[PDB]
Amino acid sequence: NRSGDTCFRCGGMGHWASQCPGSVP
Ligand SMILES: [Zn+2]
């Protein structure tokens, strides 16, 4: 958002890699 917070785990951004949605796809 206001930083280079590119979420490398999901390929998205805005959140940290450990918080990617994947419990219930
Ligand atoms: Zn993510």
TrEMBL record:
Residues 7-21 form the CCHC-type domain. Transmembrane segments: none annotated. It comes from the Eukaryota. It is found in: Cytoplasm; Nucleus. Belongs to the helicase family. RecQ subfamily. This is ATP-dependent DNA helicase Q4. It comes from Xenopus laevis (African clawed frog).
